Design a protein around this ligand. Structure first.
Ligand code: BCL
Ligand code: BCL
Ligand code: BCL
Ligand code: BCL
Ligand code: BCL
Ligand code: BCL
Ligand SMILES: CC[C@H]1c2cc3[nH]c4c(c3C)C(=O)[C@H](C(=O)OC)c4c3nc(cc4[nH]c(cc(n2)[C@@H]1C)c(C(C)=O)c4C)[C@@H](C)[C@@H]3CCC(=O)OC/C=C(\C)CCC[C@H](C)CCC[C@H](C)CCCC(C)C
Ligand SMILES: CCCCCC/C=C\CCCCCCCCCC(=O)O[C@H](COC(=O)CCCCCCCCCCCCCCC)COP(=O)(O)OC[C@@H](O)CO
Ligand SMILES: COC(C)(C)C/C=C/C(C)=C/C=C/C(C)=C/C=C/C(C)=C/C=C\C=C(C)\C=C\C=C(C)\C=C\C=C(C)\C=C\CC(C)(C)OC
Ligand SMILES: CCCCCCCCCCCCCCCCCC
Ligand SMILES: CCCCCCCCCCCCCCCCCC
Ligand SMILES: CCCCCCCCCCCCCCCCCC
Ligand SMILES: CCCCCCCCCCCCCCCCCC
Ligand SMILES: [Fe+3]
Ligand SMILES: [Mg+2]
Lengths: 287, 245, 53, 273, 49, 53, 53, 53, 53, 53, 46, 53, 49, 49
């Protein structure tokens, strides 16, 4: 239980102690196995040279099986089996960590809201790595374990399914991420503005409304015509954050399974803008 | 085709509309939770309570407070204290004019809520905000300047007194108020104070020398209630509009 | 709920139940009308031939 | 005096122009001089968007509506109203309306006696919009660099501007902004869940206080940010996300004119190796 | 009454307001006649030919 | 609202009413001028021939 | 509401109802005018030939 | 739960049990109708030949 | 408002009226100068021939 | 405002008015200089011939 | 000098050392970033 | 700091100074060894000919 | 004064700091002369030719 | 005054700061003379020809 002056300026200064418990130890074991697999595959990909590892770490990854393997339960190791093992161990560690958060909420007498907000992110992660590859029958549709590689996977996923900008659930997830940033800036600024009135002590304001909660409500009522309460704004933020990953999982489930081209889907439904033909005589040379 | 119901409809469109229904239901639920304080509404001209449907006002939920008691929201309690402010003609939206001293009366930015008349407690049941002179287990970090002994300057560039003690939140280890002995003792909320360690001064630009002499004081010199806290903080907040002007 | 089960309103608030039932009925009517519009044979505004095959 | 506690707060003061003429409410909304200017600019802009919608020859839907900026050949000059001038006027009105909204928020904060953290934070979104439609276009010498005012066409603008650098994911400022946006959602979920768990402990449990709130995070991650530190952290995270978005867009074109992946040659071929 | 004005004050204010509005409308009618003389703004069956 | 309805100002506040009316009239005038500017025949600054077909 | 139903205003506030009605009427008028402007036969400022098909 | 186990409602709250059951039943009915609509042989509005292969 | 309606300032604040009028007039002047600059004939800084068609 | 209207400053704060006027004048001067620089005949740093057609 | 009666010698020295180390690293990288002064790559001077 | 300045430690904490100096020296040594390894001529493990041109 | 150093302590610290800075600058000057002798870093009118 | 520094301590500080700034400006003038002797930085009418 050490102290931290620099962290004590933005917030509290105490770091620890941390309670791991049984599920915490299990999650750490699973996750360390996953991290060891990923990192050792990265280090072997530069022929064990740590100079080249330092040079190329953003470009390095553990790569999923190729499409030639399909949904083979355990492909050959150096052909995606390492990726499948790392994904299994990471998923087990993440699920055990979710159970750990649920249990920590229960043992403190607190509600399990953080656990069910983590469940949305776990749902998105599972759709990204396991659930969608199972339905499409190919491990190759899953992100690599790498810094620049999962950005490449992101771009190539958008390109493969025709401009994921035209995925309505991608639009909704972007709206919810922008709204998460919007709502959290709103709430941070509002609570900081009424911090002179005791507004940072929100739970005390929930069971006993003070002038801080009243003025925080009235600022937004006079600004945009409606407001929340000291507790309801946290439900607003919680739901906005949950919807990000919920719509993300929903829009990734629908890509390739029910919709294969999103721009053409928007064209069918009157969503894609039509632009004046600046290039009048361009056709497909292979037609 | 794979994900089609017709030549126009398809699975993604239906899942999108299902999420539209779910999102609109969630927004309705959230707006119901927004109405747990301040509703039902009242008119700006006679204070008549406006009728809100039972589908917009949720049933009261009970909060079992940590130190005992049950708070319900909504609670059918309405702030009906007499506001010492007037306006010419009861026109909807017409702002009010304080009759006397808005800071002492608590009008506008000086208005405060009738909170609990008991001091805030901790988990173990001991007073949360106490002066540092009473608790020996709490000290000030040596890396930060000590506010005690610093001169207190109001918004009129007048030294109104000196800092005699600091009131610390025992649940968060943070200085909540500054006990200032006026050159007779007042509490200055720390967010309303600016510190200068080179000149050893504390500037409270929201107060004048006249306003410091009328700051509400706690009944006890080592104990402050939530209502006294709320009143003092509201006084200093209303000083931003009513003091230097 | 049958013609004789009149004590259901001692359990469900008539106001909120009517409002919720109206909302559900309007949403369901809109959904069914739009599914009819979304098919060639039952889009009465497009007027396709009945034999859509 | 609409809420059950609002009457005592509806007083005179807070005006930034020093006058009582506009000091009044219309319904729940507070009207100021800047409220009037906000409505002026807003109605002008919305009516011009509707005009551009009804004058579109392709009969677009609400999604396909697009008011595009002028051509890059017009430079920083003035375009025909149907050839980019409408976009220019809507941009001017939008900037005016956003600044007026921020100033009206300043007025409301002054009336309520609270800090100006909210207008200041909204100024970051206003700065992002300005950097996208005014500053970056002037840095590049043409108003045609701004995004079209359409629900779906501004997505196409974003896509083509990103593919002008062959891989926009490799922009370092873009990486920082995405990291901060995702961290903002993570922190908002954690904070909302913690406050909801403290306020709704369940059946048979009392409402938890600051000790439980700090204990939950010290027991989970190993550090507790506090109740005041969490809101500062959230405001800082959102503002950093928008600031790094502004940086990444101001270095794309004005600074970087080539592919973004090859910018990392500074690290791949750092003088060390 | 509600606005705090007396009916005597309201009558004089309405006199001034009515005069101002009637003048504004007269100027608008003259401007519209001038604009029609400049270019008529209702098309025929053939348009602006 | 006619010439003889002077008691409207006992119900509508002259200040707020005139601020709203001035704002609305100015914005409406701007909109109608922009509409003329956006059409070939009535853009007097571009000065196209009156017969635009 | 009819000529003889003068007691609406004991239920509806005259001032707020007038503001809401003015807003609704101006928004509806703008909507219909823009709808007319968006069609080739009823865009009086574009002045297309009346027989547009 | 059978015709004779009437003491379930001493364990489950009737009002919330019926609300949750109605929600589940409506969601399941919508899901199965859309599952039928998603297949050529059972989309009654598209009207493909019953012989589908 | 006329040369003889001096009691308008007993209702309308001179300070707000002056600061709002100055802002409006500056904005209007800027808008009209920009609109003139945006057309071939009236852009004086560009100096096109007056006969632009 | 004239040479003899000295009581303006009994209505307008001399210091806030001074700073607002300074900001406005600086911004206006910058805008006009940039407008001159954006046109060929008046960009004195590019030095185009005065006769620009 | 009395400089140290106003500025803390410890903090001034630790900040100056950090600044000098950063500056030395940056200038050495500047020299390694040119072919003429990259003494490790050993390109011809001219 | 020279041999005769033994009073440095009256102003600098010896333990913190030693820890910071050890960290700085290890990081600098690693940086220079990586700098040697990243160049063909001074990479002793790769063993390129000294004459690298 | 502002810092808890006596004027004598500050004078001694300044003496040692000045000596150390002079030594650092002398070593840097010799290093720069050696680097110039290695390869001059100010080009002539023709460049590095 | 508003700083709290004594008017004599401020005088000493300004003396030392003035000497430091004068030395800095002298070094800058010497560096600028040397840079002009290396390559003059004000072009003639013909430019860098
Ligand atoms: C300029 C000197 C006087 C003034 C002198 C007069 C005189 C004389 C008359 C008016 C009249 C009117 N004035 Mg006036 N008016 C003044 C300032 C104002 C202000 C203001 C807040 O600045 C407003 C909104 C108005 C508004 C109005 C209109 C509502 C009204 C007729 C409408 C119109 O003609 O054009 C539409 C309005 C606008 C486009 C906005 C207003 C623009 C200008 C300021 C209107 C004044 C026009 C006036 C004839 C010019 C006389 C000044 C000459 C240089 C001597 N005046 C000042 C105090 N005004 C007329 C009236 O009510 O009779 C029926 C009339 O005879
Ligand atoms: C202009 C001088 C007077 C005025 C004089 C009259 C007279 C006389 C009549 C009306 C009538 C009406 N007036 Mg009026 N009216 C005034 C100001 C207003 C204001 C306002 C807030 O400014 C509004 C919303 C109205 C609204 C209305 C309508 C609701 C009503 C019938 C609708 C209509 O005929 O045209 C449709 C409405 C519009 C197109 C928009 C409304 C705005 C304008 C101002 C309507 C007034 C035009 C009026 C008919 C012309 C007479 C004035 C001449 C220039 C002398 N008046 C001022 C106070 N008004 C008539 C009535 O009661 O019906 C039996 C009627 O006979
Ligand atoms: C116009 C002058 C009177 C008025 C005179 C009458 C008379 C006479 C009748 C009605 C009738 C009705 N009025 Mg009415 N009505 C007025 C103002 C209103 C307002 C309003 C908020 O301003 C509303 C919403 C209504 C609404 C209605 C309808 C609900 C109702 C029948 C619907 C209908 O016929 O068409 C559908 C309605 C709409 C699409 C919107 C309504 C808009 C206008 C105002 C409706 C006018 C209808 C009426 C025929 C007007 C002609 C009156 C002539 C001058 C004689 N009235 C004013 C006060 N009204 C009828 C009725 O009650 O049936 C038994 C009827 O016979
Ligand atoms: C239908 C009207 C009665 C009812 C009358 C009976 C009778 C009679 C029997 C059961 C039996 C069962 N009921 Mg029952 N049951 C009722 C409502 C319920 C509800 C509910 C929440 O509404 C649930 C979850 C159940 C659950 C069950 C099952 C656990 C059990 C047999 C499993 C099964 O058939 O698989 C399929 C089940 C499901 C997929 C979920 C349940 C769906 C329906 C409601 C189950 C009823 C099936 C039953 C055979 C139909 C009999 C009605 C005829 C008209 C006689 N019943 C109501 C109160 N139920 C059987 C039993 O207990 O075996 C020893 C049995 O013999
Ligand atoms: C410059 C010295 C004096 C001054 C001396 C005079 C004199 C003399 C006159 C005015 C007049 C006017 N002044 Mg003045 N005026 C001053 C400062 C101001 C300020 C300001 C906030 O600084 C403003 C907004 C004004 C505005 C105005 C106008 C409202 C008014 C007539 C408009 C006009 O002619 O052109 C439009 C204005 C603008 C577009 C912006 C204003 C620009 C300048 C500052 C206005 C002064 C111009 C004036 C005509 C030139 C005479 C001054 C000479 C230098 C001696 N003055 C200062 C204090 N002013 C005239 C009047 O009252 O009408 C009967 C008049 O005869
Ligand atoms: C043997 C190591 C002795 C030491 C003995 C001496 C002697 C003797 C001298 C210095 C001098 C200096 N020392 Mg020493 N110095 C020590 C530790 C330090 C440490 C440290 C935190 O460890 C630092 C930052 C310094 C810094 C410095 C410089 C500021 C100063 C002249 C700059 C220079 O020579 O090269 C630049 C500095 C660096 C790049 C970093 C420092 C690297 C090493 C530690 C400095 C030693 C250089 C010195 C010539 C070694 C000769 C020792 C022989 C036995 C004679 N010394 C220890 C106590 N040091 C010189 C001086 O004061 O000039 C008037 C001088 O004559
Ligand atoms: C800086 C951190 C985040 C932030 C902060 C923030 N935004 C804020 C606030 C804060 C703290 C407010 O106080 C303020 C508010 O009141 O929120 C309710 C606001 C606000 N953030 C808003 C939205 C918003 N914020 C966004 C983002 C963010 N806001 C950041 C992530 C986005 C994004 C990413 O897309 C949007 C859409 C508004 C709800 C509100 C400001 C409302 C406002 O300005 O009202 C006045 C203007 C109008 C009513 C309309 C004017 C219309 C124009 C005249 C014409 C249209 C022009 C427009 C460019 C067309 C666009 C077309 C297509 C591109 C869609
Ligand atoms: C809040 C701040 C706001 C202000 C930000 C802007 C401030 C800028 C100050 C910049 C100071 C520059 C000082 C001199 C820089 C020397 C160059 C340098 O620092 O080295 C550079 C790399 O440095 C590096 O990343 C350094 C990092 C290396 C380690 C990274 C871990 C590379 O050098 P170059 O010669 O470009 O080689 C590239 C080509 O020319 C030849 O292939
Ligand atoms: C040498 O290394 C040392 C020892 C020093 C350790 C250091 C390690 C380092 C440095 C590691 C660095 C790792 C990095 C940078 C990783 C980055 C990863 C990123 C960015 C990933 C992004 C996205 C990845 C996703 C979404 C993956 C999802 C995968 C899933 C969900 C897979 C699930 C698989 C399952 C459930 C498999 C089950 C087993 C079955 C059932 C198939 O068995 C039959
Ligand atoms: C574009 C997405 C939807 C955004 C809707 C925002 C609406 C905000 C304004 C609400 C105004 C309410 C006015 C009435 C309040 C109660 C008055 C008694
Ligand atoms: C037709 C779709 C309807 C969707 C309704 C969604 C309602 C979500 C409610 C979430 C919160 C429930 C209450 C949780 C309180 C705290 C429990 C510990
Ligand atoms: C309008 C006449 C035809 C077009 C002539 C060229 C117009 C564009 C070039 C001049 C204007 C561009 C520079 C504007 C600078 C504005 C700075 C605020
Ligand atoms: C940050 C706002 C703009 C600052 C001034 C930009 C000056 C350069 C503009 C160059 C325009 C002409 C060249 C590009 C076409
Ligand atoms: Fe919060
Ligand atoms: Mg199918």
């Amino acid at each position: 239980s050490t102290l931290s002056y620099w962290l004590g300026k933005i917030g509290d200064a105490q770091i620890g102690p941390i309670y791991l418990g049984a599920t915490g130890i299990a999650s750490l074991i699973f996750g360390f196995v996953a991290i060891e697999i990923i990192g050792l595959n990265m280090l072997a990909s530069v022929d064990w040279n740590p100079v080249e590892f330092l040079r190329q770490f953003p470009w390095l990854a553990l790569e999923p099986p190729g499409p030639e393997h399909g949904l083979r339960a355990m492909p050959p190791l150096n052909e995606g089996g390492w990726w499948v093992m790392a994904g299994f161990f990471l998923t087990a560690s993440i699920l055990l960590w979710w159970v750990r958060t649920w249990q920590r909420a229960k043992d403190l007498g607190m509600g399990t809201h953080i656990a069910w907000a983590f469940a949305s992110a776990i749902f998105f992660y599972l759709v990204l790595g396991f659930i969608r590859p199972v339905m499409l029958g190919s491990w190759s549709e899953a992100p690599p374990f790498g810094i620049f590689p999962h950005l490449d996977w992101t771009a190539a996923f958008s390109i493969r399914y025709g401009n994921l900008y035209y995925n309505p659930f991608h639009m909704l997830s972007i709206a919810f991420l922008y709204g998460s940033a919007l709502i959290f800036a709103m709430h941070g600024a509002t609570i900081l503005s009424v911090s002179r009135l005791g507004g940072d002590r929100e739970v005390e304001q929930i069971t006993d409304r003070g002038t801080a909660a009243e003025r925080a409500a009235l600022f937004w009522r006079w600004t945009m015509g409606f407001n929340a309460t000291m507790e309801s704004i946290h439900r607003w933020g919680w739901w906005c954050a949950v919807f990000v990953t919920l719509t993300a999982g929903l829009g990734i489930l629908l890509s390739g399974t029910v919709v294969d081209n999103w721009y053409l889907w928007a064209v069918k439904h009157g969503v894609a803008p039509t632009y004046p033909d600046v290039f009048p005589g361009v056709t497909d040379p292979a037609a | 085709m794979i994900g089609d119901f017709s030549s126009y409809m398809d699975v993604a469109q239906i899942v999108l509309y299902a999420f539209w229904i779910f999102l609109f239901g969630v927004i309705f639920y959230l707006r119901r939770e927004d109405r747990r304080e301040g509703y039902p509404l009242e008119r700006d001209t006679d204070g008549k309570i406006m009728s809100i449907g039972p589908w917009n006002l949720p049933a009261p939920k009970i909060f079992y407070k940590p130190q005992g008691g049950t708070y319900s929201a909504p609670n059918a309690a309405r702030d009906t204290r007499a506001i010492k402010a007037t306006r010419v003609g009861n026109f909807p939206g017409a702002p009010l004019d304080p009759t006397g001293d808005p800071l002492v009366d608590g009008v506008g930015p000086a208005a405060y809520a009738e909170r609990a008349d008991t001091p805030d407690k901790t988990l173990e049941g001991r007073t949360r905000i106490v002066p540092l002179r009473t608790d020996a287990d709490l000290w000030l970090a040596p890396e930060d300047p000590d506010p005690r002994g610093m001169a207190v300057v109001a918004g009129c560039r007048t030294t109104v007194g000196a800092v005699s003690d600091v009131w610390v939140d025992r649940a968060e280890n943070i200085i909540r108020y500054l006990e200032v002995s006026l050159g007779k003792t007042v509490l200055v909320p720390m967010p309303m104070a600016v510190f200068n360690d080179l000149t050893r001064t504390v500037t409270v630009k929201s107060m004048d020398a006249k306003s410091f002499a009328n700051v509400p004081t706690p009944k006890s010199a080592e104990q402050i209630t939530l209502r006294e806290e709320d009143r003092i903080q509201a006084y200093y907040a209303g000083g931003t509009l009513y003091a230097n002007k | 709920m049958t013609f004789s089960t009149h004590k259901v309103w001692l359990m469900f608030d008539p106001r909120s139940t009517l409002v919720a039932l109206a909302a559900f009925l309007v949403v369901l009517a809109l959904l069914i009308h739009f599914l009819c519009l979304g098919h060639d044979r039952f889009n009465w505004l497009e007027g396709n031939p009945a034999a859509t095959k | 005096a609409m809420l059950s506690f609002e009457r005592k707060y509806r007083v005179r003061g807070g005006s930034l122009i020093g006058g009582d003429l506009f000091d009044f409410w219309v319904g729940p909304f507070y009207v100021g001089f800047f409220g009037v200017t906000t409505l002026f600019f807003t109605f002008v802009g919305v009516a011009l968007i509707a005009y551009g919608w009804v004058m579109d020859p392709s009969d677009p839907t609400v999604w396909q509506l697009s008011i595009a900026p002028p051509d890059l050949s017009y430079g920083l000059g003035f375009a025909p109203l149907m050839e980019g001038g409408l976009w220019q006027i809507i941009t001017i009105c939008a900037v005016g309306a956003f600044v007026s909204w921020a100033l009206r928020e300043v007025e409301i904060c002054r009336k309520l006696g609270i800090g100006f953290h909210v207008p200041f934070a909204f100024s970051f979104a206003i700065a992002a919009y300005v950097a996208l439609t005014v500053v970056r276009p002037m840095l590049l010498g043409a108003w045609g660099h701004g995004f079209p005012y359409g629900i779906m066409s501004h997505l196409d603008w974003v896509s083509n501007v990103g593919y002008q650098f062959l891989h926009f994911h490799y922009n370092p400022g873009h990486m920082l902004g995405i990291t901060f946006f995702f961290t903002t959602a993570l922190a908002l979920a954690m904070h909302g869940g913690l406050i909801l768990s403290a306020a709704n402990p369940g059946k048979g449990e009392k409402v938890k206080g600051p000790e439980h709130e700090n204990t939950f995070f010290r027991d989970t991650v190993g550090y507790s940010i506090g109740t005041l530190g969490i809101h500062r952290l959230g405001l800082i995270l959102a503002l950093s996300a928008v600031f790094w978005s502004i940086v990444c867009m101001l270095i794309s074109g004005p600074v970087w004119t080539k592919g973004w992946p090859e910018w990392w040659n500074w690290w791949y071929e750092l003088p060390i190796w | 009454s509600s606005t705090g004005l007396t009916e005597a004050e309201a009558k004089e204010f309405h006199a001034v307001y009515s005069q101002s509005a009637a003048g504004f409308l007269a100027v608008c009618a003259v401007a519209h006649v001038l604009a029609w003389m400049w270019r008529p703004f209702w098309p025929g069956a053939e348009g602006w030919v």
